[PDB]
Amino acid sequence: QRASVSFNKPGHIPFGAVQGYAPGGVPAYSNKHDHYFSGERNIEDNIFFGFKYQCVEFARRWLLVRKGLLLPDVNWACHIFQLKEVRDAATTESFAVLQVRNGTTTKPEADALLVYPSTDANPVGHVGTITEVGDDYVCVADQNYRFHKWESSCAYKLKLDHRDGIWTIIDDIDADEIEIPLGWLTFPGRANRPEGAPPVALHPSLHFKEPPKPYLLRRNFLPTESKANWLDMNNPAERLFVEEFGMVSYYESNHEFHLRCVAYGTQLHAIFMEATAQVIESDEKLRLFAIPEEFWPRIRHSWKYQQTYISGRFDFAFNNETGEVKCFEYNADSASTLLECGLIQQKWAESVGLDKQDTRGSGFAVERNLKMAWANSGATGRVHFCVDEEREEQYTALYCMQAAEAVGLEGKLCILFDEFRFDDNGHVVDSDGVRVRNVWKTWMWESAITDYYAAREERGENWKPSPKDKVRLCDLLLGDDWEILYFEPMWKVIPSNKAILPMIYHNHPEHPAILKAEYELTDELRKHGYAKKPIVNMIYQQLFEKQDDYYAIIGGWMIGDAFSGTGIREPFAAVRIKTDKLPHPVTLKDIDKMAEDE
Ligand SMILES: [Cl-]
Numbered sequence: 001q002r003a004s005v006s007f008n009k010p011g012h013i014p015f016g017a018v019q020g021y022a023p024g025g026v027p028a029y030s031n032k033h034d035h036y037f038s039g040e041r042n043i044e045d046n047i048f049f050g051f052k053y054q055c056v057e058f059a060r061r062w063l064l065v066r067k068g069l070l071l072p073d074v075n076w077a078c079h080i081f082q083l084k085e086v087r088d089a090a091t092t093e094s095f096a097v098l099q100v101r102n103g104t105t106t107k108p109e110a111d112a113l114l115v116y117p118s119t120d121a122n123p124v125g126h127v128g129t130i131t132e133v134g135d136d137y138v139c140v141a142d143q144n145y146r147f148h149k150w151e152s153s154c155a156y157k158l159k160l161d162h163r164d165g166i167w168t169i170i171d172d173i174d175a176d177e178i179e180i181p182l183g184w185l186t187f188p189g190r191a192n193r194p195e196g197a198p199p200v201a202l203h204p205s206l207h208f209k210e211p212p213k214p215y216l217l218r219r220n221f222l223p224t225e226s227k228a229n230w231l232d233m234n235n236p237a238e239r240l241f242v243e244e245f246g247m248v249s250y251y252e253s254n255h256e257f258h259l260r261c262v263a264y265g266t267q268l269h270a271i272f273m274e275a276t277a278q279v280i281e282s283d284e285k286l287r288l289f290a291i292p293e294e295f296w297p298r299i300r301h302s303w304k305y306q307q308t309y310i311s312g313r314f315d316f317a318f319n320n321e322t323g324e325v326k327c328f329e330y331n332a333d334s335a336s337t338l339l340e341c342g343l344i345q346q347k348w349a350e351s352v353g354l355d356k357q358d359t360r361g362s363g364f365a366v367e368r369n370l371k372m373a374w375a376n377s378g379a380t381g382r383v384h385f386c387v388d389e390e391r392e393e394q395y396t397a398l399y400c401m402q403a404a405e406a407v408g409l410e411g412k413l414c415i416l417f418d419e420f421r422f423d424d425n426g427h428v429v430d431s432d433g434v435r436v437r438n439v440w441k442t443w444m445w446e447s448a449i450t451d452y453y454a455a456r457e458e459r460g461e462n463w464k465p466s467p468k469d470k471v472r473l474c475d476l477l478l479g480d481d482w483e484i485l486y487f488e489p490m491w492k493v494i495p496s497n498k499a500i501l502p503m504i505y506h507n508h509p510e511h512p513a514i515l516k517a518e519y520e521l522t523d524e525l526r527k528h529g530y531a532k533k534p535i536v537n538m539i540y541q542q543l544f545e546k547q548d549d550y551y552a553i554i555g556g557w558m559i560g561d562a563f564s565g566t567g568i569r570e571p572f573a574a575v576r577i578k579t580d581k582l583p584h585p586v587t588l589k590d591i592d593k594m595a596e597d598e
Pocket of ligand 1: 002003
């Protein structure tokens with residue numbers, strides 16, 4: 001009936017899989033899906049090509065293999081069009097490129113970098129490689145645009161229009177979204193390196209140097225400008241926040257700290273998902289995780305049916321001396337503190353004047369990634385956002401709801417269960433008679449399980465749902481309709497259970513962020529030092545080694561499948577990321593931009 005959903009889209013190939021080869025033997029690797037950021041550098045033979053696998057990464061790696069020229073650092077792809085100078089990889093000698101505008105009498109040529117402008121859904125623009133030119137087409141090799149396995153030596157072919165001697169490359173593959181590139185960069189006077197030529201030997205001056213150690217430093221600040229009414233009371237979420245909490249100190253990181261969180265967060269999310277699958281398929285593990293046996297079929301169906309999810313938050317610890325990040329838990333079934341990270345902390349920074357050019361807020365990607373999670377969640381139609389009478393649950397719901405609605409979903413906030421009736425056929429419908437199909441909720445699956453059993457005593461087990469009956473939590477979350485999409489799905493209780501911590505350590509002891517953890521105390525744990533943590537028996541976890549006497553826990557947000565930001569609790573504290581200044585930016589608008597924006 002209703003079809004299974006997943007964040008993996010048909011015919012898109014996994015992250016890092018080879019899509020194909022541009023002429024001259026340059027592989028394009030999959031970046032999973034658009035706007036995906038891995039946090040992982042691609043460094044081969046001491047050359048830093050870019051982030052696995054963004055479009056500038058391919059451009060730089062292509063340019064080096066094909067022509068032996070090194071593309072300088074540039075943050076936004078569209079800014080490549082203002083490039084005047086690359087460097088010869090072997091000599092470091094400067095080499096001048098030629099800017100050729102699209103839509104003039106100059107025909108494009110093979111072995112040029114094609115640059116797309118910034119659009120509304122592609123703020124960074126795009127770069128690819130023109131591999132071949134015909135009388136009415138150009139072939140383009142790139143990364144991070146199309147995710148299919150290539151059938152030939154390019155990702156796609158673009159129309160090349162010719163009218164009155166004027167040549168215009170038009171991207172009209174997708175029907176509505178017609179994009180017209182800015183132009184392309186040629187490398188006049190530089191031949192392609194020979195077939196079979198030995199690899200390019202980068203001059204030692206141009207090798208990747210060790211970036212500075214991550215840092216996370218507590219700062220104390222006396223504001224220059226301080227705004228009194230810095231939240232928008234016409235936004236419901238912000239109004240409820242001000243009603244809970246009302247209208248200095250903060251944390252500053254560097255970009256290396258942020259990247260480590262993105263990389264470790266993304267990698268851990270996969271590790272936790274892998275261990276969740278092992279629990280799902282084991283009866284003994286389901287028992288250990290205190291899933292009642294009666295719900296085993298329900299939770300196993302959830303795991304197969306719904307591989308989408310909106311939010312989850314790691315708890316990280318960080319050591320400033322060693323740069324080490326460790327993970328204590330994945331609060332994978334929660335959205336608590338999202339609004340604070342995604343919005344409040346930036347608006348606070350602006351009010352006291354911290355929104356200077358030299359930093360950005362650490363929850364900058366949250367809003368965009370939320371919209372993206374909702375768009376690829378599988379939820380269509382009406383989504384009921386279901387909360388208790390707690391302001392925090394309400395404003396978390398409203399913030400997730402704003403994102404849903406921004407991508408064409410229709411939201412209804414439901415506080416407790418008065419919005420809902422059973423119709424003449426035993427189904428939960430709302431006050432518009434619309435039958436429930438999608439539920440985002442703050443209600444915990446454990447509370448639903450408890451409500452399920454209470455209702456079972458109260459109502460009987462011969463009980464048929466009828467229109468006279470009040471809808472309860474267990475009818476909303478654990479009803480006869482197992483094809484309702486739930487945000488956060490039922491299986492999400494598994495990665496959230498600390499019983500998983502020994503499993504991820506057994507599976508992945510090599511991972512730098514993984515704490516040693518066992519179900520029984522081992523002499524290794526006694527020697528290192530341990531904490532004994534209960535689970536709904538015990539787990540024993542290794543101990544992990546204060547600024548102005550403040551202990552701080554870092555929250556690392558997964559929003560859909562994207563690591564989307566950090567927030568701190570000492571009590572909620574703002575996190576600012578100091579921006580990497582480029583010494584030799586290609587254009588002034590590229591300063592303070594971030595490759596994370598792609
Ligand atoms: Cl459907």
